[PDB]
C-alpha cells in the first residue's frame, strides 16, 4: 500500500526479520552491507537502489563468498556458466577467486515494493547463492540442505 | 498498464516490433527475431506469475552465431562481464551465447511503457555489446549517399 522501492524500505524489511546490517556510502551511492554465515562458509551480501534516466531505478542484490577458488578458476567458470543459463541471477568468479552472485531488477522509480515480494526475491537470491556455495564446497549433508539458514 | 504479457506485446507493437505470442509447456511467451550489424538473434519475453504474489519478467537474447570452437575463452569473457555489467551471460553446449534478464515484481505490478522500453532497450544494448566483442565487429560497409527524388 505505502511501501515504495527505496533503500530505507528494504532496510526496514531486513530489520523486521532481525537481519543485522549497516548502511554505508561510497561515492554518492548508499548501500546496505550484511555478513552472512552459511553452513559451508561466510559471505557478504549487499543491496542498493540506484536511480537512472527515464524514471527507472535498479534494485541490485549481490552475494560474494569469503572463500576463494583461484586454483579451480576455469572449472568454476564453466559450472557457473551453466547455472547462469538455467537459473535466475548472474554468477561469476573474479581474479582473486571469490565467487559472486548478482541480481539486477529494473523498476519504475519509487515503484511499490511489498514486503512479501522483497522477502521472496531476497530469500530467492540467498537460496540460489547457497546452492552454488554448497556445490563449490562439495557440501551435501544427509538431512538435506536447510532451505532457511541463519545469518548468525 | 500492468505487468502482463499482453501489455508488453502492446508496447512492442506500438514500436512497430514484429512478434508472435506462442505457448510452450504451460507458459505463453513473446518470440521475436532481431537483426544486429554483426549477426542475428532470438529474443524471448515472458511473464511468469509465481507464488507469494510475485511474478518474474524474463527477457532472453540468444546469438544465432556459434562459438563452440572457442567455448572456454568465451566462457571466461562472459564471466568477467557478468561481474562488472548488468544481466546474466552464458554460452550453451551448441556454442550459442545467451543474455538473460530475470526480474521479480509484485504480481500485476505497474509497468509503464517508459520503464519497459528502458529495460528492453538496455538488454538489447548490452547483448549487442557482447555480440560485437565476440565478432570483433567494425562497420565494414559505408552509407550509400544517393538521395530522393
Ligand atoms: Br541478473
Ligand atoms: K530459477
Residue numbers in the entry:
A (entry chain A): 2 to 153
B (entry chain B): 4 to 152
Question: Any passages from the paper?
Answer:
To determine the phases, native DR1245 were formed in the presence of potassium bromide and 2 Å resolution electron density maps were produced by single-wavelength anomalous dispersion and a molecular model was built. The asymmetric unit was composed of two monomers, which corroborates the results from the size exclusion chromatography presented above. The final model includes 301 of the 306 residues from the dimer, including residues 2 to 153, and 4 to 152, of monomers A and B, respectively. Each DR1245 monomer comprises 3 α-helices packed against one side of a twisted six-stranded anti-parallel β-sheet with an α-β-β-β-α-β-β-α topology. The DR1245 dimerization interface involves residues from the β3 to β4 loop that interact with the beginning of the α3 helix of the other monomer. The surface area buried per monomer in the dimer interface is 1,425 Å2 or 15.4% of the total surface area, as defined by the PISA server. Interestingly, the dimerization interface harbors a cavity that contains water molecules and the bromide ion. A sulfate and a potassium ion are localized at both sides of the cavity and are each coordinated by the His129 from one monomer and Arg59 from the other monomer. The two monomers are highly symmetrical except for their unstructured 11 C-terminus residues. The C-terminus from monomer A is packed against its α3 helix and β2 strand whereas the C-terminus from monomer B protrudes away to interact with the C-terminus of the A monomer from a symmetric neighboring molecule.
